[PDB]
Symmetry: C10
Subunit: 74 residues, 10 copies
């Protein structure tokens, strides 16, 4: 039991590493948004929803990691 519980807690920590992808990815989306709007302000209403979609889908990958983390913790 002790070794199993120890493994769950180590595993839970490892399972958060993948969240770095969402941290970087969300930023990449918002950087494109800002750069696109600066170059062409008239396009903002068109590209803003694309940025929200892009962020949500990138974020979902990190939430999958967190899902595994919480299964191991709890």
């Amino acid at each position: 039991m002790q070794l199993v519980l120890a493994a769950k807690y180590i595993g839970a920590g490892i399972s958060t590493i993948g969240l770095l992808g969402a941290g970087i990815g969300i930023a990449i989306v918002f950087a494109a948004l800002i750069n696109g709007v600066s170059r062409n302000p008239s396009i903002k209403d068109t590209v803003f929803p694309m940025a929200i979609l892009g962020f949500a889908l990138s974020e979902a990958t990190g939430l999958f990691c967190l899902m595994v983390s919480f299964l191991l913790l709890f």
Copy 2:
């Protein structure tokens, strides 16, 4: 069996690392979509389905990682 169970849980955690690739990749596809549309608004309806296809193929690599994770946790 305690060693094997321990290994399943460590392995499950390690199996999620590869999801960082889809996290970054999905973002890269959507950034190109945004920059392409900002440069040439008329192209939107042509490139939007390319972005959907690209996101889905990138995401699938992460879903393979997650599949292995769930197999280790539950299988």
Copy 3:
């Protein structure tokens, strides 16, 4: 209990790795803000709130990592 405690401490250290994502991502958002404003100063009031949202969402991924770190430590 000592083995479980050892694992909680190792797990907590591992759980901070993912914060590198927010470190880089917050920077990527601010770089875009700066480059966008330099190229088109008149867009500043439009893109500044986009940068704030972008950084907040990227930071949230790192805060998720830190939450797991603190759950393991406490």
Copy 4:
């Protein structure tokens, strides 16, 4: 026998890390497709098959990782 089985499951998990390469690579290919079509719409029919080939070859590297994973798992 338990040490060997433990090794197989740890090894299977490690074998999925390389899939991050295909996750990023497939995206890089599709980003180029989108940017190329945006800059020169007439080139679409020419560059689309290149993107399909690029994606397939990048994905193949991740499929090799997953092959090793399943060999270790089963």
Copy 5:
């Protein structure tokens, strides 16, 4: 007690890895500042406070990592 002490020291070392994110991110912010000012010198007074804010927020992520490191050490 030896096991717990060992884990604190390994955990503390691991807890510093995330600082690479701030190392890179702080640089990305200042690179943007330099490139933006080189392209449009008149914008310097507007973008400089943005760079200070961006640096501070990226640096904070590395400080959270170091916080965990010091908690494990002391």
Copy 6:
């Protein structure tokens, strides 16, 4: 013998990590092909064999990794 067998399986898993390099690299080559052809369609027949060569050489690095993996497995 259990220890050696265990190490072969963990080593085999570790040996696949390097394949992420080819995953990314193959994509970088094809992205360049797409962007170069979009900018200058007349150059397609000249640069296509360059892309095939570049892909093959990047892929070779991942094949060396997989070679070690199979040696450890079999």
Copy 7:
């Protein structure tokens, strides 16, 4: 006591990994300086102090890693 000393030396080694962030970040800052001066030589006196500040702040993150390393070593 030997397990604890072993942990300190393993931990000290791990504590240097984060220095890669400063290695890359310092370079990113100097790359921007060089490119900015090349594009607009007259801006040299303005951007050079920015590069010095950027380098110092990026390097500081690596110095924090090295601090933990030496704490663990000695």
Copy 8:
């Protein structure tokens, strides 16, 4: 002897990780070749041998990794 052999196998797997550098690097060289030729077709005979040298030198680093892998296996 079994513990030493186990370590040689684990070490051999670890020694292939660095090949990811050549996987990416060879691609970066070929991407430049393709983009350079697309922008200036007349430069092809000048930059092609530069690409060959570039790829050879990047590949050498991966071959150094593979050498250590083979010394550990043999």
Copy 9:
């Protein structure tokens, strides 16, 4: 003492990983030098010493890693 010696050698190996940062950083500085000079040849004598300073500061981070490596191997 065998455990401690073992740890010194593993730690020494791990201490070299950070050198990848200087490997990449030195390259980034020289790439900027090359691209800057290609775009504006007259600037060469101004930016060359900036590249030397930049390379040296990036390299020093790797030399800190190596210092820890040697301390673990020999100290």
Copy 10:
């Protein structure tokens, strides 16, 4: 003795990881060379020696890693 020798061989494998930096760095230098020459062929005699210097210094970091690897192996 057995555990010490095992540690040397694992350490030797780990010591090659850092060579990925030189694999990528050497390529980055040669990519700049190729792109610079394509944009401005007349500059080739000036920038070629800069590329050789840049490659040598990037390569030196990997040779430092290899140095440690061979000390551990032999």
